[PDB]
């Protein structure tokens, strides 16, 4: 009986995205969600859903939907997939083996590239161990890769974990920035709040 459009627009048509290690998350509920407009758009270079056909999102009903948005490198889009390992997969963002949802990615060289280099996007190089699926690492303590203490001092045996992408418009196709939005659909014994455009 609930009839209103939920805000897919400000999460897709946003001006500035978050970093790789500080990916955002938006709660979505009480929705008449229309996924046909997103699927029919040709602006997305990559659109892969795992376990669900994309045309059938209209008749399905879900309880809650999670939208996660960030920006990564061109070659690193392969790492956003279940059962994958890599610099970002192991240390920044992890997908469970039983992940259900869609992955959306498109090139964003027009906004996230600067002739002098866009350094507003960060990613983690080093950490003690791989992180469990669906958690965020925000602490920026200086890494322990040696014997000598840190005491808040940067130097040998004390490596800064975060690195910055050198995004420039003249970079190769692999080095171009890409904006990635992943949708995770969870269903359980709860009153569903995200349904599709169907007349009862």
């Amino acid at each position: 009986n609930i009839t209103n459009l939920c805000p897919f627009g400000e999460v897709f048509n946003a001006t500035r995205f978050a970093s790789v290690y500080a990916w955002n998350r938006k709660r979505i509920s009480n929705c008449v969600a229309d996924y046909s407009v997103l699927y029919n758009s040709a602006s997305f270079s990559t659109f892969k859903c795992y376990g669900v056909s994309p045309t059938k999102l209209n008749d399905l009903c879900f309880t809650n939907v999670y939208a996660d948005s960030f920006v990564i490198r061109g070659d690193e889009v392969r790492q956003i997939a279940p059962g994958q390992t890599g610099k970002i997969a192991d240390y920044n963002y992890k997908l469970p083996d039983d992940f259900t949802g869609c992955v959306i990615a498109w090139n964003s060289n027009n906004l996230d590239s600067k002739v002098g280099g866009n350094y507003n996007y960060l990613y983690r190089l080093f950490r003690k161990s791989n992180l469990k699926p669906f958690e965020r690492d925000i602490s920026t303590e200086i890494y322990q890769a040696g014997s000598t203490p840190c005491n808040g001092v940067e130097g040998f045996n004390c490596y800064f974990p975060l690195q910055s992408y050198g995004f420039q418009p003249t970079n190769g196709v692999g080095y171009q920035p890409y904006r990635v939005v992943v949708l995770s659909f969870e269903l359980l014994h709860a009153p569903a709040t995200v349904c599709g455009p169907k007349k009862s």
Epitope: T15, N110, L111, S113, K114, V115, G116, N118
Partner: antibody, heavy 123, light 108 residues
Amino acid sequence: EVQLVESGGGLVQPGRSLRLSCAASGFTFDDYAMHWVRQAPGKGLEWVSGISWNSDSIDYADSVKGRFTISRDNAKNSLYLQMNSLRAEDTALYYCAKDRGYEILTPASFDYWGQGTLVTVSS
Amino acid sequence: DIQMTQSPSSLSASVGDRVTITCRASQSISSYLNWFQHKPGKAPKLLIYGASSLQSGVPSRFSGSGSGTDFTLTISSLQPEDFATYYCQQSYSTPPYTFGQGTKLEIK
């Protein structure tokens, strides 16, 4: 649906300063870059200066370096442009354009403009 | 520095004609060109951002194409509201936002 109205056009002597403003009302001014464009009376468009979504990165054209100081006021949706030591070649028409992105030097173009304010540098 | 050039100088057509305006870049700009319609009586507008991406709010009659060092813009009909000057702007090289010269279009 966006509005961009400027002010500060007039008649000044060479080497004298005058102050520009530009009012934005049809969009959200706090997350876009802004640029200033110059149109000579008998020539084509020319880029002058630009500022980021916040006062972090500022770039100037080569011919206007050390003379212009582009400002910004996110509180009331208004930017500024202080021109100092004006010469006779700066008697052109100045537009107040808006950038599609949030940075100054990006492959993003200028989507919306506004009617210019004509300035003259003569006695 | 990059030099941005306009092949046509002045063109004339009819209400049911079709003309093409071309703009040549000295150095490769990788499909990062923009086209602007500057009506001499008011503020200029934007028609096509990027090589062949058409901005919302203007008729789909206009169509752009080209990449590298060769570009072209075409108008299918030249309707009685299309008389203006068209500029091609590059946004890829170190000199920021270099504009090409004008191209007057008077239909007669």
